[PDB]
Symmetry: D2
């Protein structure tokens, strides 16, 4: 059993000093003097905050790339998540047009199975819609996966055409599934990439211009129109800039059931990072690209008002040696920045401690809303009797810095090297079991489990 | 002591089956199968929801009109509120330019003292800014009133000119006060009023065109600009229409600390009700006016996304005989529609039961966010250990209709006559004491207390 | 030679009383009291306006539908045009995906050759992009056709997918060609069509909801984004509604070289006309559909400010018997409304005589700007020495009504039956030769010539 | 008499090679071989363009400032205008709240009378609306002044309050008068000025922050609302930035009869100029302030599409010694930048020659539209038989630079020092009389006359 005593409990809709007792995997009682039994593991949260475990709706653990693979395993990625206060992650399951979807699902599941320190689930990529698709997706959804992922990008590999998007969305609606979507334009990006390379513009600084804000804005609007016409519910992944936010907001305002995620690098990093030349720039190549810094205030301001629903990472780690596969052409740089371990600390620090983000909006944006949208609430995402005992005792007196020298992610650079932090998770629990204590990793191999969900969005 | 057992507890961020025990005035413990001392008021909430007491941030109880007065007293109004599931109301304290501000506040405070069945507080109207009034306002703030009310309307009686508005906002920011604001344009309303009357256009149907959406849009944008330049935090009361929403939203999007209230008649009633002729139309005269029905969808959609932060009533009850003071000129009709008792049932029915509003957004919009914004949280607005035991056991199986024949508000008409509802409160408590039991009123005279709040917005 | 004396000359940028003399085909001199050789056709324009011949940038003359054809020939259509004050028309040359593009152009050219009473040119439809067609298009351009037409609609028959659209735009930019575009969404229209029919919703009233404003908005935004990325110049044909206007306007505001056409039925007719049932409704079926009447004000207001650049017709005449090919399914109704003869009188009446449209904006929107955009200026579109002596002596004192009983278009209904008009052409000339005299047709068969234009938009 | 032969005549709606003959003050004939009489002054325009005389709708000649006066007289200012190709200017007649309006009008008229080299007129400032105003304004308007000027700025000196603005606009509408307006906010600017000075922020770099874009956007929207409510027609002077353009465009789109002027410094200069320190910065202090450079593309793009109707200068010259009156406080820097002589050359060069502005839009924006809006067309603003023979023979082969060393404005600095030009006026005529020949000044003292106009906008 677990007793977290003397802490200040903070959720999206509560802030109070009381103790929390969990007999086993779920919270059993909250109050004063709980009378825990002999043998209970007791955590003294005096002077600290007790938050719901944080939830990252957007990560990449297993991911092939051209001739290689991203760096985290389920083991290394879940450890890194927990150290950062993230107790549930949702991975993009990404079979390509060339792969069988159901085989893909099964392959991802097999990688994670028994190998995660914390709970997890998947969004299912629909990278084509052919005569076999519907039956396979129906099997995946009935297996507990209540979200799809589509790409309006990556022509012939992940992108879906308008007919396929229509079919996907109509099936999602019939199934109650939420459609997450990467919103660019496959044709425009591919053509601009090719034109730029044909002019000898090969370095990393041409990535951003190959897929400018206008392209993300067109795809975000297109997705919204297709949700509106089909009746499906959707979720825009990694929204990066003002034109896209305007398109998604206009859809929200007119009644489209559309939600918005932004990811941490777009709040804190900007397009000049990718203008640094060489491998230093390649570290900062992701899609959508880092943008003009003017977009940061726009995202922060929108987050503070709840216009942006969730904050994820689009965690996608590669070693510098892998980055350098793009030395001759920017199109060959594996895209991604790592961030799974640093999301909470970065949001707390630059939002709550130094910014204008309210602590309640912070909990909602980094835990609760994502749980709600993806069918993990109320098991996950809050602090209440009956919910999973996934808890973070957070130290607001902690001062430090982020660095690759102290990170757990299985690569060789940190995207926030040298950034100051104003707090950290002291203790982190997964279903009543302590996985981080005094800031140190003490997780149990395979303790995490796949979360199966019931579709909600008919 | 109080024990609410076997209910499904629903807050803005939680949903679970457990019991709640309050030894006295505040929640003491939450857990499954709690024990309570003999003699405890045990409430069996099987099959029902348990919500935080709802909170109406915008009512009028005492309010002079010519040589009469709005109809509810603190006693009638607070009883009505409770019957409807509202356990805290915030009343607009409204001395005019021709009244002394401190004498007005003391008069309002004197009316409520010992006469409310539930807790309450005030927003202080600033109907002029000058040396005496400023000193007055400073003492009112120190007495725990942490919000002001200004009017961009009602020239020479309640409205403030630009200099007054700037001075008011600056003072609010000095004092950490949030400014609530009625946003029209005092000049344009008065000129259109006078023009229409000059044309013999005297009937109630001319009230809306005397103050069209354009004027609300301008006032809302003006207020936002003033908040933006002064640094003050503000709250748009009773936002009724799309052009006003667009103005407020643009301000939110660019970082102004501005929040949005809408009131229940603007969700459910439309301008044609005020076109019915005679006293029947007069029943539906309020400011801002009921609008073209197209605005309802706009408001519901914005509410579902959290763009609108709170739902209040602008409760302002008059008898039909008093409405008829305006028989000869629409400008002489006492403005207002009653709604304090019906808000929660209406929002629950048309939003949650029949609409697209999520139950969690419902709780946030009808209780929690108002508590947060006005300094009542966490005492009010949520269910957590330590919070005032202001609770509603709500029956989602109730079916019925609203009628003047069954209302508690002390006037002779209901604006929502005949409207179906899909739920009602069964039990309602105030600080651990049951005020409504099995749908019957059992409140204790004067049990409610004035809530004093601390400055939050420096 | 021709002498038009004593008229009030009105162009987009001039308004004066003087005479115009043309020795032959072109304006030779302008001045007060000009002398002309004996035998001159002297036209006394006292009391009347003299305008540049009007120019319709969007008509259909030859157009197959199933095993029939739209009703006007080049002879009937050009006569109708002239009677209405239109001295140049631009016809959409529309071979389908299943037709050879060059054979289509040669067929269209062959239909018009020697059969037009006034000058004319074409926009070339690109209904597919592939190696053969591209070569074809290049020869058509070289023959003087400096505009293309694409369709974001009509899947598999006329529409282009994204790759085709990008290739088309890129070719246009290479060749200095302007792309005109019908902006809907081919997927969404086809799916909604099929869904509605599956529900037994077969009548004409289901045509509008099969292709709602949302779909036009999406296509207009998509086209704009494609122009923006390709560098091509473009022109939105028949823009019908506010959300489409907003998309096109946002593109204009951010610098895209995009222009906007609206057509006369969308100014004056609304969706309820297509809700009349039966053949009566079928008369009013066109694409994009007639819209909610709220859009009329939007279009008039935008026209008065020059936000809409040109007014055309989308003239596309069918007999009622042909409309009835759609008796069993709205998808089988031949789309189109006639208007070539009535455009100018309608715009003049409802805009200038009765509305808020300035006479100078009228001339620009109905003649000059179309000439500019399509490479016909300064030969066409204005009154100046050197310009083709294509002139309209317009009687602003005429009062009458439009009727099928008096029309020249070769079908059996007028969409504007009974509409009042407040002016008509008295005299109309084509290259110095009078075609309409005292309101009577006196044109010379085959006098009109194909206009060849030079590339302008590299 | 005057004959301009061999030129390429370019107006907003014509481009052709022909000759122009004027017997006296107006164009008499246009054609080839005009047969001018003995004694005619002949201008050989071979290889050059012939444009309508350009028109500056916004200048300051006589203008008091705190204890001094702007530098141009009617003599020096009109000479400078003509050298730059501007043959008509419209001066802001600016009596303050402390002055009698009719006395002001009379004073301005007396300064100009007999002292201008070219034609001119005034906009009448309405700096208060009291019991004498209406009669005085009615006398001014009946004297030929068909435009007013109002200020939403300069509290207690030029600014009008909402009641005064309402009265002004309603009288304008009754009279058919167009209301030009400086759109900021008097309260916000004054309060921010004072706050900044109170913090020791005194240098010129604090001017822009004292009246940021948001304030211009609020005033532009307010003005638009008041035009919409009163029914008056308006014209936004010197619109400088995107937020303001958005407000004015939204009003245009919804049907408000509102027009937009921008002035040349806001196309070509930016806020960093005023950050240079010292008198160098003070040279670039005007109101509205130079803005972030991002606004330039926004204005150019809007101009190219006709969203911005006119280009003026807000010519307002002061010597550097006068600028230095603001050495201790930025509020004491006389505001203004000179530009009357350089407007055309700057627009031609950076718009037509090096930019994307079409030559027709250039003529419209710099001549024709302003003539139309202010009742000077068709006497002024175009090239047609009967119009005043105000003509510019412009040399497109001229290459040079702008400098104070070669300027005619009666001050000691040029705001475009060192800017390259790609053309210049070779010959300029006023009502048939040559005022500039071979680029040299040959004007006749007092040849210019006051233009009286008939109101148009009821
Ligand atoms: Zn992605
Ligand atoms: Zn991703
Ligand atoms: Zn109010
Ligand atoms: Zn109120
Ligand atoms: Zn079409
Ligand atoms: Zn067409
Ligand atoms: Zn000004
Ligand atoms: Zn000025």
């Amino acid at each position: 059993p677990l007793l977290i005593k003397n802490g200040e409990i903070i959720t999206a809709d509560s802030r109070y000093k009381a103790d929390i007792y969990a007999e086993g995997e779920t919270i059993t009682r909250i109050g004063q003097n709980l009378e825990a039994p002999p043998g209970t593991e007791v955590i003294d949260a005096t002077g600290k905050y007790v938050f719901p475990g944080f939830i990252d709706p957007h990560v990449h653990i297993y991911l092939p790339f051209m001739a290689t693979f991203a760096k985290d395993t389920h083991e290394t990625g879940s450890k890194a998540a927990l150290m950062g206060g993230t107790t549930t992650y949702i991975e993009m399951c990404c079979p390509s047009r060339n792969d069988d979807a159901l085989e893909g699902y099964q392959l991802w599941k097999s990688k994670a199975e028994g190998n995660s320190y914390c709970d997890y689930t998947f969004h299912m990529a629909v990278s084509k819609f052919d005569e076999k698709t519907e039956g396979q997706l129906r099997e995946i959804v009935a297996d507990g996966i209540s979200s799809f992922k589509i790409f309006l990008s990556y022509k012939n590999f992940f992108g879906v055409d308008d007919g396929e998007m229509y079919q996907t969305l109509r099936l999602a609606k019939e199934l109650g599934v939420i459609v997450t979507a990467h919103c660019e334009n496959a044709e425009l990006v591919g053509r601009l990439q090719q034109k730029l390379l044909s002019e000898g513009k090969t370095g990393p600084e041409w990535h951003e211009p190959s897929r400018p804000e206008a392209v993300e804005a067109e795809g975000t609007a297109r997705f919204a129109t297709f949700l509106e016409t089909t009746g499906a519910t959707g979720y825009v992944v990694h929204l990066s800039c003002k034109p896209a936010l305007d398109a998604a907001m206009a859809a929200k305002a007119r009644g489209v059931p559309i939600y918005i995620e932004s990811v941490i690098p777009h709040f804190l990093l900007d397009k000049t990072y990718a203008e640094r030349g060489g491998v230093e720039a390649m570290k900062y190549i992701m899609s959508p690209p880092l943008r003009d810094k003017r977009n940061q205030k726009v995202l922060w301001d929108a987050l503070a008002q709840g216009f942006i629903d969730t904050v994820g990472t689009d965690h996608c780690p590669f070693d510098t040696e892998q980055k350098l596969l793009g030395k001759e052409a920017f199109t060959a740089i594996p895209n991604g920045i790592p961030a799974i371990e640093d999301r909470v600390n970065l949001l707390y620090t630059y939002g709550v401690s130094r910014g204008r983000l309210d602590i309640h909006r912070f909990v909602d944006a980094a835990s609760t809303k994502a749980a709600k949208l993806f069918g993990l609430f109320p098991r996950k995402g809050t602090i209440a009797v009956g919910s999973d005992a996934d808890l973070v005792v957070y130290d607001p007196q902690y001062r430090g810095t982020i660095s690759v020298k102290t990170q757990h992610v299985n690569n060789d650079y940190n995207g926030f090297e040298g950034f100051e932090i104003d707090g950290r998770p002291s203790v982190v629990t997964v279903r009543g079991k302590v996985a981080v204590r005094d800031g140190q990793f003490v997780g149990e191999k395979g303790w995490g489990k796949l979360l199966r969900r019931e579709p909600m969005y008919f």
